[PDB]
Design a binder for this molecule. Structure first.
Ligand SMILES: Cc1cn([C@H]2C[C@H](O)[C@@H](COP(=O)(O)OP(=O)(O)OP(=O)(O)O)O2)c(=O)[nH]c1=O
Ligand SMILES: [Mg+2]
Ligand SMILES: [Mg+2]
Length: 571
DNA sequence: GACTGCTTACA
DNA sequence: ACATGTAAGCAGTC
């Protein structure tokens, strides 16, 4: 049984003096075992001899300072667990999960210290964690401005702040561990929690591990959420409207839709109805023209003919190769006229309902009876379960190295794979969800402004009679009338602003209606736009050309990472 | 360069 | 040992 420690660094913010000026560590099950000091060499000496599991909140930041030390002290990168090497799990998107430091072997025992990311377990700011877990949190923060030379001596106040930060994570992590949420990440606990319910025995019988190749071609049919701005409204200031939001859309599909299980059977040509294998994926070649009065539903990515984000009214005189679930193919056929159709091949699946019942009943209840970070964690259990099923077996990551200038560089590592989970599930969950969303959007064609995944934005303020029977503020899978706005402007996908009607309840602002409102909330939704920049946005300046030099970006410099303000522009 | 790589936000 | 797609900005790559 290895010891567990909560750790943190305070670092300088100078590009060309970049260094740790303070560290802290605290035993997660013995808060009286802790140490605060001013030296990274002193900390790393402890790291080397402690033979424990370490946690930093946001390992991506602290790990840069740690790997810079390792590379300067005779440690090189190796996955082969040799003496005086470190291993990392850094993903190809650049998520840090682990730094594993190997000092050697005494018998059949590895001598090593392992460092993990507590952000993977608790993806919130430290203060949010303290508020929502109900833990002691000190007011204010360390002065990020003060001049701190080498050997700078930590004040009593800074010492208290550092100790508070490490103790908050310690207490929160311990709360989770004692419930059995002890794995590396929140998603890992979700899949493990699901396997506990249905049994591991039943898991690999119902969700067999597919060959890497079969999983790859299943994945051809795997697509995300429907994100679409009606061109009619693009860049226009508009009046009153409303937003409908599905109550947990993906889990809702998991709960009640017919979904694939088992090994698929390959077929050639056009799928022939098989009651025992009622779901399929079909490889189709065709040209297509959107029918009059229908929303476009076809997006083709990685093509020189089409912009990947654009929903297509026409194939433009080129033959489209498409891999499609039966739910998607049926939707495509309702919205489009098809030309020169070739049914090439496909895969058909056994199917059933209700495999996720107990797991979703558990976590929807925890979500409903919880608040803040604790609610968001229950939400994450539900959503990471879907993601886990569609886990990409390509786990090739990044290998750190020390550049000639003293800064960390990264190279793509040797290709590697892990077993698939069950990707057909992912295919049909998103498929049933697109179906849910698109059919509702299509039923409100005369009023539809905008869709993103689980939501429809409409003109006017009354519920359409055609969706009245599937609207509910709480029921899983139903549409909630979430808000009503006084005015809005949608510039493009994931880029819009709204003036929302609010009313006060018990001193708390709640969504209201055009007759039952006291306050107007300005809301900004803009992919890539960080929170400080959002505060700069007005109805008047929210247009193409809006720019602020306020976006923090982490720059690798000699010694570690500095956050430097970069520009963000609506192009 | 158009591309991808390196980062965030919206789901 | 590592949940998902999608959409975006900007510094690099002839
Ligand atoms: C936020 C989020 C959403 N999604 C997908 C699945 C969700 O059903 C869908 C819409 O999610 P959201 O509307 O963002 O979140 P939610 O409905 O689960 O919870 P809430 O509305 O209370 O904030 O997008 C993920 O797969 N992972 C995520 O982390
Ligand atoms: Mg939503
Ligand atoms: Mg929602």
């Amino acid at each position: 049984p290895r010891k567990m420690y909560s750790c943190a660094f305070e670092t300088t913010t100078k590009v060309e003096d970049c260094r740790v000026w303070a560290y802290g560590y605290m035993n997660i099950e013995d808060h009286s075992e802790y140490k605060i000091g001013n030296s990274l060499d002193e900390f790393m000496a402890w790291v080397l001899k402690v033979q424990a599991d370490l946690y930093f909140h946001n390992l991506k930041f602290a790990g840069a300072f740690i790997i810079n030390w390792l590379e300067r002290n005779g440690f090189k990168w190796s996955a082969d667990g040799l003496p005086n090497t470190y291993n990392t799990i850094i993903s190809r998107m650049g998520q840090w999960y682990m730094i594993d430091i190997c000092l050697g072997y005494k018998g059949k025992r590895k001598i090593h210290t392992v460092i993990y990311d507590s952000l993977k377990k608790l993806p919130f700011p430290v203060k949010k964690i303290a508020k929502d877990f109900k833990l002691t949190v000190l007011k204010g923060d360390i002065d990020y401005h003060k001049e701190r030379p080498v050997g700078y001596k930590i004040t009593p106040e800074e010492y208290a702040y550092i100790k508070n930060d490490i103790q908050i994570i310690a207490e929160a992590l311990l709360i989770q561990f004692k419930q059995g949420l002890d794995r590396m990440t929140a998603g890992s606990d979700s899949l493990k929690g699901f396997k506990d319910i249905i049994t591991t025995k039943k898991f690999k019988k119902v969700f067999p591990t597919l060959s890497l190749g079969l999983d790859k071609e299943v994945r051809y049919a795997y697509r995300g959420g429907f994100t679409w701005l009606n061109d009619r409204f693009k860049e226009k200031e508009i009046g009153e409207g409303m937003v409908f939001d599905v109550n947990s859309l993906y889990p809702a599909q998991m709960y009640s839709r017919l979904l694939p299980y088992g090994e698929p059977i390959v077929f050639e040509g056009k799928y022939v109805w098989d009651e025992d294998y009622p779901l399929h994926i079909q490889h189709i070649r065709c040209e297509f023209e959107l029918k009059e009065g229908y929303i476009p539903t076809i997006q083709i990515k990685r093509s020189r003919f089409y912009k990947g984000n654009e929903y297509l009214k026409s194939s433009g005189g080129e033959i489209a190769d498409l891999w499609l679930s039966n739910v998607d193919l049926e939707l495509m056929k309702e919205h489009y006229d098809l030309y020169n159709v070739e049914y090439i091949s496909g895969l058909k699946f056994k199917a059933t309902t209700g495999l996720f019942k107990d797991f979703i009943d558990k976590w929807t209840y925890i979500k409903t009876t919880s608040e803040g970070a604790i609610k968001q964690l229950a939400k994450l259990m539900l959503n990471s379960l879907y993601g886990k099923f569609a886990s990409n077996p390509d786990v090739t990551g990044k290998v750190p190295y020390l550049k000639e200038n003293g800064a960390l560089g990264f190279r793509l590592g040797e290709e590697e794979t892990k077993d698939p989970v069950y990707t057909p599930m992912g295919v049909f969950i998103t498929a049933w969800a697109r179906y849910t969303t698109i059919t509702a959007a299509q039923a409100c064609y005369d009023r539809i402004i905008y869709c993103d995944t689980d939501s429809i934005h409409l003109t006017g303020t009354e519920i359409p009679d055609v969706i009245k029977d599937i609207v509910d503020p709480k029921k899983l899978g139903y549409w909630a009338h979430e808000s009503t706005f006084k005015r809005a402007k949608y510039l493009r996908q994931k880029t819009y602003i709204q003036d929302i009607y609010m009313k006060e309840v018990d001193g708390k602002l709640v969504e209201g209606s055009p007759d039952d409102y006291t306050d107007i909330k300005f809301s900004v939704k803009c992919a890539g736009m960080t929170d400080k920049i959002k505060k700069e946005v007005t109805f008047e300046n929210f247009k193409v050309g809006f720019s602020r030099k306020m976006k923090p970006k982490p720059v690798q410099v000699p010694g570690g990472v500095v956050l430097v303000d970069d520009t963000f522009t609506i192009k």
